[PDB]
Write a protein that binds this ligand. Structure first.
Ligand code: CLA
Ligand code: CLA
Ligand code: CLA
Ligand code: CLA
Ligand code: CLA
Ligand code: CLA
Ligand code: CLA
Ligand code: CLA
Ligand SMILES: CCCCCCCCCCCCCCCC(=O)OC[C@H](COP(=O)(O)OC[C@@H](O)CO)OC(=O)CCCCCCCCCCCCCCC
Ligand SMILES: CC1=C(C/C=C(\C)CCC[C@H](C)CCC[C@H](C)CCCC(C)C)C(=O)c2ccccc2C1=O
Ligand code: SF4
Ligand code: SF4
Lengths: 147, 743, 88, 80, 30, 157, 143
């Protein structure tokens, strides 16, 4: 052990920059780490699965939050075929004035990106109607990522 | 010590016995193939003479006969060219209307519908438009009828026969001796005065007797059939005096030193002749006369057998200073022992000369009606650029070969080379830093401009309208060139070229020939890109040369040879450490440099020069002067150059240019085909061939010559060969289609 | 000598090529000025916290209190919104 | 450092020791083959992993085996 | 107003702290 | 007579002596730069290096930045230079944290080009580098302030 | 029984002007190597680091940065010229470690005082499958 990576002595005893790269590229290869057993193998896999589920819930939670905050969902329900759905808002200090002008679309106050994932149609078809519904789903998934 | 003719008689017998034995030259290859790799080695070591034997005399005689064979093939090629100009061409029709007729010298047979490629070229002719420029050359020389081209083709065939016979003669019969080859002083004397001097004098003699008068009659509008034959200007001098009066004297001012009379046909007016668009033929003849005199004088520097003259050994040894030690002492022994050293020097110089030719022929059109044949000019420029780049990469390769095989400080030492080797590290590190600095401060500017134009900030770009980076030095130089005639060049009537002198726009047949070339921020950025790419190519090749023998990673690299794959996966990995792989990568980088160079040329000429001129003097260029604003951006190069000008090649189907549309995609195909070799390694392919061999052996149909995947070096060679072929042929099809359609 | 198993600093070139080793050219008073006013910045851990937090709060101040006259992103669009290819 | 192993299929031609560029291989007496000698790798701390020894083994399959392991300053071929 | 606080906090301050802290841990010795 | 000689007379040390490397003008000038004053408190050497670099950095940021032509706020572009000094003072700080430990001695050479023993430069010590970072920061922000303090009667302001 | 020669400092070094391929800080803080040979006369020999040097007549000492540089130079000293050579390792403490020729006999020549290291007594294809050494610190070839 003694230094990064703590799971590989041969990488830690590398005097070159190769120590860092191989320490990153082999972090999830549990079977190659020092002093690994069948128990520790399945257990690290189990916890990694939970961490992944937490990642997925947090990711979907964030998507709901921006659609409900900077999006068009309430306005898009009224005109499903004439409203460009909004992904989120753009805040880039490198924008020139025309960049702010050309990117302001979908019926928003600032520059926005037009969402192309289809979550607007998905959420309208399953019963979500107001931004309040999207806020509720985001809190639930933020809480699910927590558990 | 006395230069003289030295040959041996019948050193090698003429027989077909060694024809029937493949790989006879090599001792390991002559046993026949055990595996298929043999078949490749036979071609890879076919011309490696210094690896077949160690006797310098055998090597020199083989090289001499190979030169004769090359000259035979070049003469056969020229015979074919002149014969096609005589038999399957419309040269007589192009001679009457050079501004409307398209030059063509190839007609295809009608078999599978390919007769569509026989397009309407004018003059009642269906064929393939040629861009080699042989029509302009044959007009400048004074050729009019197909009979003269026939006779030139027959003479070239006879000369090819002579060269082939001489190649057989100086290897199988009277084969020269080593000291004969090593008489460098005599050889340089005969090449400066005998070859170049007398050659320039002979061509000046032709130009003052055939080119000038026949071209005067062609400029005057006289019908070529009604033009007197050239030899009629050698009999009745009244004909020569009616065009150039000084010929009425008869070599008397030449001997009496009244040369001021010959200013009628030996002039220094410069610029272009406004009727043809080429340089004044009188100026070209005067030039060849001056070149002849200069070379005839220069061919007397080196001593031979009459005491007077120089010995190159003394001149070398005398040039040593306090920084370089006893420099140059030993170089005369190196350059008289190693063929590869001479080959490196001559490849470097000939390639750079080809590049200089490419520049000088576009900026000073030498042949009549060449400047307006946009296809011919673009093709000549690009072709010469590629020739030069390849030859310089070969110079690098052979320098490395000399380092590996002919370098030995215990026998033929040189202080300069040893000092270079003793700080190769500093040299390479500094070139590396220069390359990084140039990469940031040229391409990084393009990325800056792209990111500013995409963010709606056109004033924060580097442009002629915003943050300007004017090439002040080149502008001042071309201005000084413009003002030189009449000041720092009183004999000159006009500017050296038209790209210098302000005004003086020459146009021929409704199309422009040449005009002053603007230089702005775009030119600055592109020139720095060129410098950067040249520097990186030089870095790769020179680093391969200097580290060919030893390095901190492999201190015995010279024992591994010049061409070896690696030295194992150890030391972290030793792939592509040989100098051969350095040439292999320098090939890609030379391609990457030359491509940007020729694209710069194409866009600049189509934007700021080439175009159509009005009756009142309104010039509209092929592209609407879009070079200043569009070429300062990578997206501009993608859109306003590639996407816009590839239309002709992607629309050529159903016309005579459809062959270019086919070659476009075929070259795309072979370029992507190379990526299979460049991205993979031979172990996987051998493991695949194993199962394939199982399948063959199951049905009693496996070959004795055991199949083997290509070698690592061969993998890289095939990869780079196909990569280069694909890229260059793609650009070739694109350029030719574009310039023949919009030209 | 150049190879001496005793002192390997001289054998392997562990020298100070451009070190002066001369006394200070910085006069007094001036040095005490900088040694008392640049004193709290010479604790590398404290300087690290001070730089990160101070620099981050400085960045947060000038970003939260930005101006439309300086940044086009805060000025927002001044023109009426455009019309999409089919939609709003 | 890299691991190097010698298998008893060795015929004792001393070719792996001649090709080794860092003096890792040795020829010790043995009774298994005709040349009365087998190879050994007592100095793998200097082994660089070039596998120049495997390229010279006439045994099928190889009798020298270089298993690239933990990299060190010596195994990476660093002069710095 | 919130983007004017969180966009620099994740594109400037967060990578600064993250890269510096990872540098100290990677280069640390025991 | 020759100009290039081995480094301190030893040909097997990877370097050479040239007018760029070993010359009285170069040797004196480098020996008088604050980074090579191996007997001076690193806080003061940091002050000088910080003052010089903080003063230099203001020019490019002000004349090339985005607000360069908006003269209402372009002169305040020294903040960018000051921010880089902050960032660089972090780079300097985090460098010493990893390079030198608290109880570690100096890693600088303890010899002289002539062989005599020498006291190692305290810059390659944890506390010495900490003083240099603190000095570079103090001189750095002072260099940026002093550079922005001047603005007028210059051909490129 | 063999006794390795101790490294004698103040031994002459070949004539060389200096090159950039010499020692670095690795020699100062990590390690470096030293090769010694006898030689009959003053000759020129190619350096494994740079250009050419003049091999002094009589005892010669040459300090290099890597071990492979020493053996490569020694092999050429044994091939082109006919010169015996030894080389050692030098730690920054001043300690010297004799390396090659270890037994005083060249390693390609069998010597009775040598012990087996890493010699597996089976066909190379008789190694075990990796699953049989899983969760252990073993390899199928260490055995
Ligand atoms: C345009 C690029 C290109 C092309 C054409 C190919 C083509 C091929 N790849 Mg390949 N590959 C590529 C890129 C490419 N690859 C890249 C970038 C990679 C990543 C490294 C790979 C990695 C890869 C792997 C790992 C494998 C292949 C395999 C194959 C072969 C599949 C068999 C087949 O489809 O029948 C033939 C298809 C063709 C396109 C052949 C076209 C050429 C014909 C024969 C021209 C006819 C000759 C004609 C007379 C012209 C005259 C030439 C004259 C000079 C003599 C095939 C020849 C597989 C294989 O080997 O198959 C067994 C294999 O396992 N490829
Ligand atoms: C994975 C989900 C996710 C994703 C991809 C994004 C992405 C984005 N967010 Mg956002 N955010 C999220 C979740 C997410 N957010 C959640 C759950 C909240 C609380 C309801 C917020 C609250 C929020 C605000 C107030 C703002 C943004 C803004 C932004 C944009 C600018 C970047 C930024 O400021 O970073 C994100 C900043 C945060 C404070 C979110 C991090 C906090 C949550 C709990 C995530 C946990 C982070 C944790 C420490 C590390 C996560 C591990 C790994 C998965 C990254 C950007 C497109 C800004 C914007 O609109 O740009 C114009 C902005 O103003 N976000
Ligand atoms: C992803 C996050 C991010 C963010 C939020 C910014 C934000 C900004 N960038 Mg930047 N940039 C980024 C990523 C980012 N960038 C990346 C990844 C690159 C590499 C391609 C660049 C390359 C880049 C360049 C080349 C430039 C910018 C510039 C700017 C500024 C232009 C707007 C302006 O005029 O403000 C105000 C302008 C000022 C000069 C005021 C400066 C703001 C104060 C001084 C900040 C104080 C810093 C603080 C003390 C310490 C910060 C570090 C700390 C967290 C450790 C702006 C504040 C421009 C600039 O900085 O102007 C000189 C510019 O030149 N950026
Ligand atoms: C649920 C799916 C799954 C799971 C659990 C695993 C699990 C595992 N894989 Mg695997 N793999 C998968 C799918 C999966 N894989 C897929 C779909 C592919 C095809 C791409 C591969 C191809 C693959 C290979 C070739 C290898 C593994 C290996 C491994 C093992 C070690 C991984 C590791 O620690 O390296 C760490 C991984 C990383 C550090 C990721 C870094 C590289 C990513 C791709 C870069 C990110 C892209 C880019 C920078 C981001 C976007 C750009 C930005 C500008 C937007 C591990 C047990 C390795 C192994 O141990 O072999 C025995 C091995 O070599 N996998
Ligand atoms: C005035 C004398 C003279 C002339 C004209 C030439 C001309 C030529 N030499 Mg040459 N040479 C000479 C003297 C001369 N040499 C002397 C004194 C020596 C040293 C003894 C050499 C040694 C030498 C070598 C080693 C080589 C040449 C080569 C060449 C050819 C270079 C390729 C080229 O330029 O293509 C241009 C083509 C032409 C100009 C066509 C004209 C060719 C005419 C017909 C040849 C007539 C010149 C010839 C020496 C006369 C004797 C032949 C006679 C007995 C029948 C070229 C034709 C290279 C070669 O062999 O190429 C095959 C080469 O390898 N020469
Ligand atoms: C190798 C080149 C070359 C050759 C083969 C010739 C050959 C010839 N020249 Mg010529 N000449 C040359 C170069 C050459 N010239 C150059 C460079 C100039 C410019 C100074 C001249 C200027 C010149 C003049 C003024 C005349 C000739 C004439 C002649 C012819 C007279 C020969 C005779 O009968 O006695 C002859 C065929 C004379 C002529 O026309 O005879 C019919 C004549 O009047 N020449
Ligand atoms: C006057 C110029 C000249 C001369 C005399 C030589 C001579 C020699 N070269 Mg060299 N070289 C040159 C220029 C020259 N080169 C240039 C310009 C380059 C840069 C590309 C190189 C790069 C180079 C390398 C990397 C190597 C050599 C090698 C050699 C030696 C062996 C040649 C051989 O047998 O290969 C055999 C020839 C072939 C197998 C033909 C290959 C097919 C080509 C590459 C593709 C054909 C494409 C064609 C142009 C168009 C497509 C048509 C197709 C569709 C039918 C030999 C003494 C080799 C050597 O061993 O050095 C001692 C070596 O590896 N050369
Ligand atoms: C598009 C692909 C690509 C790119 C970008 C490069 C780039 C480079 N090559 Mg390379 N090369 C390529 C393809 C490419 N190559 C291929 C296919 C081959 C195989 C033949 C090679 C073979 C090759 C060789 C043999 C060598 C190089 C070398 C170099 C470097 C030259 C030094 C330089 O220009 O510095 C400038 C850097 C650039 C031009 C890259 C773009 C930099 C941008 C504009 C700056 C952006 C910075 C920004 C702030 C990033 C921060 C963002 C942050 C948030 C992450 C350079 C970085 C040479 C070298 O090592 O350098 C001396 C060299 O020896 N190349
Ligand atoms: C040619 C320009 C180089 C002038 C060298 C100046 C020059 O000619 O000095 C001349 C100098 C002295 O040579 P000597 O007095 O030993 O000459 C005597 C014999 O060697 C010659 O017969 O040579 C050197 O300095 C050694 C090379 C080191 C210098 C390497 C620097 C490389 C950088 C060059 C690139 C920047 C400029 C690019 C030009 C576009
Ligand atoms: C595809 C590929 C191969 C396989 C390529 C091979 C085997 C080329 C040989 C194919 C030709 C077609 C075999 C020659 C066939 C004979 C001409 C006989 C044919 C009979 C008549 C049709 C003429 C490698 O060997 C290789 C090696 C190293 C890196 C990458 C690669 C790589 O990518
Ligand atoms: S891999 Fe190379 S260094 Fe290692 S034992 Fe084999 S030959 Fe010697
Ligand atoms: S190369 Fe193979 S067969 Fe020869 S001695 Fe070495 S291990 Fe034995």
């Amino acid at each position: 052990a003694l230094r990064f990576p703590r799971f590989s002595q041969g990488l830690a005893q590398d005097p070159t920059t190769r120590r860092i790269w191989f320490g990153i590229a082999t972090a999830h290869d549990f079977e190659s780490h020092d002093d690994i057993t069948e128990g520790r193998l399945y257990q690290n896999i189990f916890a990694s699965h939970f961490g992944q589920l937490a990642i997925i819930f947090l990711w979907t939670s964030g998507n709901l939050f921006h659609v409900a905050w900077q999006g068009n969902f309430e306005a898009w329900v009224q005109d499903p075929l004439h409203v460009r759905p909004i992904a989120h808002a753009i805040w880039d200090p490198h924008f020139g004035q025309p960049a702010v002008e050309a990117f302001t679309r979908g019926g928003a106050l600032g520059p926005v990106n037009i969402a192309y994932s289809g979550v607007y149609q998905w959420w309208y078809t399953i019963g979500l109607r107001t931004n309040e519904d999207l806020y509720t789903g985001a809190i639930f998934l933020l809480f699910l990522s927590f558990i | 010590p006395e230069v003289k003719i030295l040959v041996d008689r019948d050193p090698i017998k003429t027989s077909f016995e060694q024809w029937a034995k493949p790989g006879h030259f090599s001792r390991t290859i002559a046993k026949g193939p055990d595996t298929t790799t043999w078949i490749w080695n036979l071609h890879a070591d076919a011309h490696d003479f210094d690896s077949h034997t160690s006797d310098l005399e055998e090597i020199s005689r083989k090289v001499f006969s190979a030169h004769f064979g090359q000259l035979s093939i070049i003469f056969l090629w020229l015979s074919g060219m002149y014969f096609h100009g005589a038999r399957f061409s419309n040269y007589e029709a192009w001679l009457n209307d050079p501004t409307h007729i398209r030059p063509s010298a190839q007609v295809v047979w009608p078999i599978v519908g390919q007769e569509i490629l026989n397009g309407d070229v004018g003059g009642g002719f269906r064929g393939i438009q040629i861009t080699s420029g042989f029509f302009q050359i044959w007009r400048a020389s004074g050729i009019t009828s197909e009979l003269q081209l026939y006779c030139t083709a027959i003479g070239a065939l006879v000369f090819a026969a002579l060269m082939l016979f001489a190649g057989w003669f100086h290897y199988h019969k009277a084969a020269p001796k080593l000291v004969w080859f090593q008489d460098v002083e005599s050889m340089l004397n005969h090449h400066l005065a005998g070859l170049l001097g007398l050659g320039s004098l002979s061509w000046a003699g032709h130009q003052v007797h055939v080119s000038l008068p026949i071209n005067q009659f062609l400029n005057a509008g006289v019908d070529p059939k009604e033009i007197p034959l050239p030899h009629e200007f050698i009999l009745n001098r009244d004909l020569l005096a009616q065009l150039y009066p000084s010929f009425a004297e008869g070599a008397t001012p030449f001997f009496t030193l009244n040369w001021s009379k010959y200013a009628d046909f030996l002039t220094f007016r410069g610029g272009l002749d406004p009727l043809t668009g080429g340089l004044w033929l009188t100026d070209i003849a005067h030039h060849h006369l001056a070149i002849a005199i200069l070379f005839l004088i220069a061919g007397h520097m080196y001593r031979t057998n009459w005491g007077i003259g120089h010995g190159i050994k003394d001149i070398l040894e005398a040039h040593k200073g306090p920084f370089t030690g006893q420099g140059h002492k030993g170089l005369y022994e190196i350059l008289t022992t190693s063929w590869h050293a001479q080959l490196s020097i001559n490849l470097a110089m000939l390639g750079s000369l080809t590049i200089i030719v490419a520049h000088h022929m576009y900026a000073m059109p030498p042949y009549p009606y060449l400047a307006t044949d946009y296809g011919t000019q673009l093709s000549l420029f690009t072709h010469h650029m590629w020739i030069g780049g390849f030859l310089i990469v070969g110079a690098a390769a052979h320098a490395a070969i000399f380092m590996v095989r002919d370098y030995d400080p215990t026998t033929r030492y040189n202080d300069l080379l040893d000092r270079v080797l003793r700080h190769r590290d500093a040299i390479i590190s500094h070139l590396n830093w220069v390359c990084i600095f140039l990469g940031f401060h040229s391409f990084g500017l393009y990325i800056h401009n792209d990111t500013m134009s995409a963010l709606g900030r056109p004033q924060d770009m580097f442009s002629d309208t915003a943050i300007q980076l004017q090439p002040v030095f080149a502008q001042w130089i071309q201005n000084t060139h413009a003002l030189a005639p009449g000041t720092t060049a009183p004999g000159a009537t006009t500017s050296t070229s038209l790209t210098w002198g302000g005004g003086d726009l020459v146009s021929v047949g409704g199309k422009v020939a040449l005009l002053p070339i603007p230089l702005g921020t775009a030119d600055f950025l592109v020139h720095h890109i060129h410098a950067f790419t040249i520097h990186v190519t030089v870095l790769i090749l020179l680093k391969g040369v200097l580290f060919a023998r030893s390095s901190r990673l492999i201190p015995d690299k010279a024992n591994l040879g010049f061409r070896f794959p690696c030295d194992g996966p150890g030391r972290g990995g030793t792939c592509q450490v040989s100098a051969w792989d350095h040439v292999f990568l320098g090939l890609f980088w030379m391609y990457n440099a030359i491509s940007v160079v020729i694209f710069h040329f194409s866009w600049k000429m189509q934007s700021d020069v080439w175009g159509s001129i009005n009756d009142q003097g309104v010039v509209t260029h092929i592209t609407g002067g879009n070079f200043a604003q569009s070429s300062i951006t990578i997206n501009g190069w993608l859109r306003d150059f590639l996407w816009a000008q590839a239309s002709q090649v992607i629309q050529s189907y159903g016309s005579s240019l459809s062959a270019y549309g086919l070659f476009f995609l075929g070259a795309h195909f072979v370029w992507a085909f190379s990526l299979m070799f460049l991205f993979s390694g031979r172990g996987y392919w051998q493991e695949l061939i194993e199962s394939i061999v199982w399948a063959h052996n199951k049905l009693k149909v496996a070959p004795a010559t055991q199949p083997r995947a290509l070698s690592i070096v061969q993998g890289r060679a095939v990869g780079v060969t196909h990569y280069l072929l694909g890229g260059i042929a793609t650009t070739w099809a694109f350029f030719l289609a574009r310039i023949i359609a919009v030209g | 000598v150049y190879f001496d198993l005793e002192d390997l600093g001289n054998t392997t070139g562990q020298w100070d090529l451009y070190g002066s080793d001369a006394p200070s050219p910085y006069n007094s008073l001036q040095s005490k000025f900088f040694e008392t006013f640049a004193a709290p910045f010479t604790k590398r851990g404290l300087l690290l916290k001070f730089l990160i937090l101070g620099g981050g709060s400085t960045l947060a101040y000038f970003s939260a209190t930005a101006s439309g006259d300086i940044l086009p992103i805060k000025k927002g669009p001044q023109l009426p919104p455009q019309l999409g290819p089919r939609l709003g | 450092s890299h691991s190097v192993k010698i298998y008893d299929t060795c015929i004792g031609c001393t070719q792996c020791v001649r090709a080794c560029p860092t003096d890792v291989l040795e020829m010790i007496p043995w009774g298994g083959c005709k040349a009365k000698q087998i190879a050994s790798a007592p100095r793998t701390e200097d082994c660089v992993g070039c596998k120049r020894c495997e390229s010279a083994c006439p045994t099928d399959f190889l009798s020298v085996r270089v298993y690239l392991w933990h990299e060190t300053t010596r195994s990476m071929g660093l002069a710095y | 107003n919130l983007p004017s606080l969180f966009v620099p906090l994740v594109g400037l301050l967060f990578p600064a702290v993250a890269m510096a802290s990872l540098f100290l841990h990677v280069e640390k010795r025991l | 007579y020759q100009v290039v000689q081995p480094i301190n007379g030893d040909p097997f040390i990877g370097s050479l002596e040239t007018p760029v490397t070993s010359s009285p003008l170069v040797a004196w000038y480098l020996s008088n730069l604050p980074g090579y004053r191996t007997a001076v408190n690193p806080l003061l050497r940091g002050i000088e290096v910080g003052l010089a670099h903080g003063f230099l950095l203001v020019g490019p940021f002000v004349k090339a930045g985005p607000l360069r032509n908006t003269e209402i706020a372009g002169q305040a572009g020294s903040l960018a230079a000051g921010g880089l000094v902050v960032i660089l003072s972090i780079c300097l700080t985090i460098y010493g944290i990893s390079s030198f430990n608290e109880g570690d001695p100096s890693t600088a050479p303890s010899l002289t080009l002539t062989g005599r023993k020498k006291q190692p430069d305290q810059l390659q010590t944890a506390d010495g580098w900490a003083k240099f970072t603190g000095g570079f920061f103090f001189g750095g922000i002072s260099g940026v302030i002093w550079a922005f303090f001047l603005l007028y009667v210059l051909d490129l302001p | 029984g063999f006794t390795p020669p101790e490294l004698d400092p103040n031994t002459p070094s070949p004539i060389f002007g200096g090159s950039t391929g010499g020692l670095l800080r690795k020699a100062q803080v990590e390690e470096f190597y030293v090769i010694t040979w006898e030689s009959p006369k003053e000759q020129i020999f190619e350096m494994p680091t740079g250009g050419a040097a003049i091999m002094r007549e009589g005892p010669n000492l040459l300090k290099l940065a890597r071990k492979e540089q020493c053996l490569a130079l020694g092999t050429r000293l044994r091939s082109k010229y006919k010169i015996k050579y030894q080389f050692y390792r030098v730690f920054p403490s001043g300690e010297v470690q004799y390396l090659h020729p270890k037994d005083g006999v060249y390693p390609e020549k069998v010597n009775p005082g040598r012990q087996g290291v890493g010699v597996n007594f089976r066909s190379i294809g008789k190694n075990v499958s990796p699953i049989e050494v899983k969760f252990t610190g073993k390899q199928p070839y260490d055995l």
